[PDB]
Amino acid sequence: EAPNQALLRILKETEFKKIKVLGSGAFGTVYKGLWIPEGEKVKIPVAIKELTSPKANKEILDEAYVMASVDNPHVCRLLGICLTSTVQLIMQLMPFGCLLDYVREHKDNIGSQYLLNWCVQIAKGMNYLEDRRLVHRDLAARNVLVKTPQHVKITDFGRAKLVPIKWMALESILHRIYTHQSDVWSYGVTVWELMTFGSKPYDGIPASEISSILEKGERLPQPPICTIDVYMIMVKCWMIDADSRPKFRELIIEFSKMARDPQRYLVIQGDERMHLPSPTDSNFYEEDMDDVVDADEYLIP
Numbered sequence: 001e002a003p004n005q006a007l008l009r010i011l012k013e014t015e016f017k018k019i020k021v022l023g024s025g026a027f028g029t030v031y032k033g034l035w036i037p038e039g040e041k042v043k044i045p046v047a048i049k050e051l052t053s054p055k056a057n058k059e060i061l062d063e064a065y066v067m068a069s070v071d072n073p074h075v076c077r078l079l080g081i082c083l084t085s086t087v088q089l090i091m092q093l094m095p096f097g098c099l100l101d102y103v104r105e106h107k108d109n110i111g112s113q114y115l116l117n118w119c120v121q122i123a124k125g126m127n128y129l130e131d132r133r134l135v136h137r138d139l140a141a142r143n144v145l146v147k148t149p150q151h152v153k154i155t156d157f158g159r160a161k162l163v164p165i166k167w168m169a170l171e172s173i174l175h176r177i178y179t180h181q182s183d184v185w186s187y188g189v190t191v192w193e194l195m196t197f198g199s200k201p202y203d204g205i206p207a208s209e210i211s212s213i214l215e216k217g218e219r220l221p222q223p224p225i226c227t228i229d230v231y232m233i234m235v236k237c238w239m240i241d242a243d244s245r246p247k248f249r250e251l252i253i254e255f256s257k258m259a260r261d262p263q264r265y266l267v268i269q270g271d272e273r274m275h276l277p278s279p280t281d282s283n284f285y286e287e288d289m290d291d292v293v294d295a296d297e298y299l300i301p
């Protein structure tokens, strides 16, 4: 197919300061930092990921490849890599972390407008990966980051091509078949994760039982806040026949119509009165805030 002319930026170790830890576990760690390029007079808030062994470096450079090859407002792009003993990825900082923990910690202020807009945004990012012929293979609320409460982006590649059993389509569990339509099943589970404010899908059920459970016809239950309209979409993502599930372009359309009148599709007690932080809030944006630019506003030719 087409030649991948994406640029892989190699960033100097001496170009980024104020390194603090955000999260550690399984693979390695994710750090908070500030990237100050050349004599650019800019400070970019960044996230530095590291999984020394040749196996860890191969897996991280595989994600670097995929992340450098993507450019969408709802996909987390690579700013560059740092060639230290262990190769570390440098991406845009999403200060609020993963959506899974966000819906859990902020449920009392999460309204229908926010939830449906999140669904539209995830579908837009997922439809972009489909245009770029990329199958995510690991879509979940834990792999969707929060830049601002009104802006979310898809993250965690490396599993992406051209195991999370409870987020997987039946063909993937049984035959290891991964398609854009299997990412649609993962999208369905992700939506369920949001509508339940971070519930564990099939909680208590061991992963070895899931395959049989799905084959019998059992699916994730209807969340209390969900109307038949929203749940019908979720159910459609969990059909045996992959070609019967909605396409991501149909999911954008469906959720957009719904996001126009959110109270008609999601029933949350004390809705609209709820408010989350915005760039219009007081002290929304620690060091010299003078020359700080977000990565979304830092473009290179």
Ligand SMILES: CN1CCN(c2ccc(NC(=O)c3c(Nc4ccnc(N)n4)cc[nH]c3=O)cc2)CC1
Pocket (backbone or CB within 6 Å): 022, 023, 030, 046, 047, 049, 076, 091, 092, 093, 094, 095, 096, 097, 098, 145, 155, 156, 157
């Ligand atoms: C109480 N909590 C403490 C930790 N907090 C936090 C955790 C992680 C990030 N950031 C990230 O996880 C992050 C990325 N994480 C990952 C994770 C796995 N794979 C990739 N490629 N990126 C990627 C880009 N930008 C980010 O900010 C930001 C904040 C949230 C509040």
